[PDB]
Design a protein that fits this description.
It is built from no helices and seven strands. It is mainly β. A five-stranded antiparallel β-sheet has the order 6-5-4-1-7, with no helix packed on it. A two-stranded antiparallel sheet has the order 2-3. A hairpin with a 2-residue loop joins strand 4 and strand 5. This is Rho GTPase-activating protein 4.
Length: 76
Protein backbone atom coordinates (compact mmCIF):
# COMPACT_ATOMS: atom_id res chain seq x y z
CA UNK A 1 0.00 0.00 0.00
CA UNK A 2 1.01 3.61 0.62
CA UNK A 3 -0.06 4.77 -2.84
CA UNK A 4 -1.68 8.07 -1.92
CA UNK A 5 -3.32 10.46 -4.37
CA UNK A 6 -1.48 13.69 -5.17
CA UNK A 7 -4.46 15.93 -5.85
CA UNK A 8 -6.99 16.63 -3.10
CA UNK A 9 -5.55 16.63 0.40
CA UNK A 10 -6.09 18.62 3.59
CA UNK A 11 -4.66 18.27 7.09
CA UNK A 12 -6.37 19.88 10.08
CA UNK A 13 -3.89 21.23 12.63
CA UNK A 14 -4.43 22.91 16.00
CA UNK A 15 -2.71 26.16 16.96
CA UNK A 16 -0.53 25.18 19.92
CA UNK A 17 -0.07 28.88 20.65
CA UNK A 18 -1.44 32.23 19.47
CA UNK A 19 0.50 33.43 16.43
CA UNK A 20 0.48 36.63 14.38
CA UNK A 21 1.66 36.68 10.78
CA UNK A 22 4.45 39.23 10.40
CA UNK A 23 3.40 40.03 6.83
CA UNK A 24 0.50 39.37 4.45
CA UNK A 25 2.25 36.14 3.46
CA UNK A 26 2.04 34.83 7.02
CA UNK A 27 -1.25 34.10 8.78
CA UNK A 28 -2.64 34.82 12.25
CA UNK A 29 -4.67 32.82 14.77
CA UNK A 30 -5.25 32.29 18.49
CA UNK A 31 -4.22 29.12 20.34
CA UNK A 32 -6.83 26.45 19.65
CA UNK A 33 -7.89 27.91 16.31
CA UNK A 34 -7.73 25.07 13.79
CA UNK A 35 -6.15 25.67 10.38
CA UNK A 36 -6.33 23.68 7.14
CA UNK A 37 -2.87 22.72 5.89
CA UNK A 38 -3.20 22.79 2.10
CA UNK A 39 0.33 21.47 1.52
CA UNK A 40 3.84 21.75 2.96
CA UNK A 41 5.40 25.16 2.29
CA UNK A 42 8.83 24.97 3.92
CA UNK A 43 11.01 23.00 6.34
CA UNK A 44 9.19 24.59 9.28
CA UNK A 45 6.18 26.13 7.53
CA UNK A 46 2.96 25.15 5.75
CA UNK A 47 0.25 26.54 3.48
CA UNK A 48 -3.27 27.12 4.77
CA UNK A 49 -6.25 29.46 4.60
CA UNK A 50 -7.68 31.15 7.70
CA UNK A 51 -11.09 32.79 8.09
CA UNK A 52 -11.16 34.99 5.00
CA UNK A 53 -7.36 34.94 5.07
CA UNK A 54 -4.72 33.00 3.13
CA UNK A 55 -1.03 32.53 3.83
CA UNK A 56 1.64 30.36 5.43
CA UNK A 57 1.43 28.49 8.73
CA UNK A 58 4.06 27.88 11.45
CA UNK A 59 4.85 24.19 11.95
CA UNK A 60 6.14 25.04 15.43
CA UNK A 61 3.00 26.81 16.64
CA UNK A 62 0.80 24.07 15.18
CA UNK A 63 0.43 20.43 16.21
CA UNK A 64 -0.44 17.91 13.49
CA UNK A 65 -3.12 15.27 14.19
CA UNK A 66 -2.37 11.67 15.16
CA UNK A 67 -0.32 10.41 12.23
CA UNK A 68 2.11 13.19 11.34
CA UNK A 69 3.92 13.09 8.00
CA UNK A 70 7.03 10.93 8.37
CA UNK A 71 6.91 8.64 5.34
CA UNK A 72 9.23 6.21 7.10
CA UNK A 73 8.77 2.62 5.92
CA UNK A 74 8.32 0.12 8.73
CA UNK A 75 5.66 -1.41 10.96
CA UNK A 76 5.93 -3.30 14.24
Amino acid sequence: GSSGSSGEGVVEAVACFAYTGRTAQELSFRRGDVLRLHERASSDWWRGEHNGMRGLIPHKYITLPAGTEKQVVGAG
